[PDB]
Design a protein around this ligand. Structure first.
Ligand code: JFS
Length: 185
C-alpha cells in the first residue's frame, strides 16, 4: 500500500477511557491497570470493557495511523462512530457503529456480524489502519509483513463523525499486560 502519506497524529481521550486504563503523559500509549485508576465516572467512559477513543474526529478525507500490539494476547482496533454506546454489553459490528478487527485466543477476526476469520501467516507486531471517509472504506495492514492487506470493510455507512477505537483487552491470563502504542510517523 501507498497510504503512509495520509498519516495523522492520533492521541487518546482520557475522558472516554474505562476507569482501569492508564494512559501515558504523551497520550500515545494505554495499558490495563491492576485496579481502578482513581478517576470520577462520566457518561463517556466505556463501562464493561477496557476501551478508549482517540481525541480526533474525522468527517471527510483519507487518514492513516499505526498501532503497536507487540506480545499482546487480546485486543480490538479500528474506528467507530462518535455516538457508539458506552455503557453495558454490546457487540463490535457495523450495525452498532464499529469497524474493527481483533485478536482473541490465537485467532484474528474482523468485526462483521457474524465475525469473519482473517488469514494471517505472520503475526503482526504493528497494524496500519486506513480510512477513506468519502469512499466508505476501512482497511487494515500488517506492517510486520511488508504492509500486506489484512481486511477491507467496503460500502461502510459511517452515519456520523468517526473516532479511532482501541481495546487493550482483559488480563485474566497474566499474559496480556502489554500496552497498545501509537507508532511515530
Ligand atoms: O502492573 C504492572 C505492570 C507494569 C508495567 C507494565 N508495562 C509497561 N510497559 C510495558 C510494555 C510491555 C510489557 C509490560 C509493560 C505492565 C504491567
Amino acid at each position: 500500500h501507498h497510504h503512509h502519506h495520509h498519516m495523522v497524529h492520533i492521541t487518546l481521550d482520557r475522558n472516554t477511557a474505562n476507569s482501569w486504563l492508564i494512559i501515558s503523559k504523551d497520550r500515545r500509549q494505554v495499558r490495563m491497570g491492576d485496579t481502578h485508576q482513581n478517576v470520577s465516572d462520566n457518561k463517556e467512559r466505556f463501562s464493561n470493557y477496557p476501551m478508549v477513543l482517540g481525541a480526533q474526529r474525522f468527517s471527510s478525507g483519507k487518514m492513516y495511523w499505526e498501532v503497536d500490539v507487540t506480545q499482546k494476547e487480546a485486543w480490538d482496533l479500528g474506528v467507530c462512530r462518535d455516538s457508539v454506546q458506552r455503557k453495558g454489553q454490546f457487540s463490535l459490528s457495523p450495525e452498532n457503529g464499529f469497524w474493527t478487527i481483533w485478536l482473541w485466543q490465537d485467532s484474528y477476526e474482523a468485526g462483521t456480524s457474524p465475525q469473519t476469520t482473517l488469514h494471517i501467516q505472520v503475526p503482526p507486531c504493528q497494524i496500519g489502519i486506513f480510512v477513506d471517509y468519502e469512499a466508505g472504506v476501512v482497511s487494515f495492514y500488517n506492517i510486520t509483513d511488508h504492509g500486506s492487506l489484512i481486511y477491507t470493510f467496503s460500502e461502510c455507512v459511517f452515519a456520523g463523525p468517526l473516532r479511532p477505537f482501541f481495546n487493550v483487552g482483559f488480563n485474566y491470563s497474566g499474559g496480556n499486560a502489554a500496552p497498545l502504542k501509537l507508532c511515530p510517523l
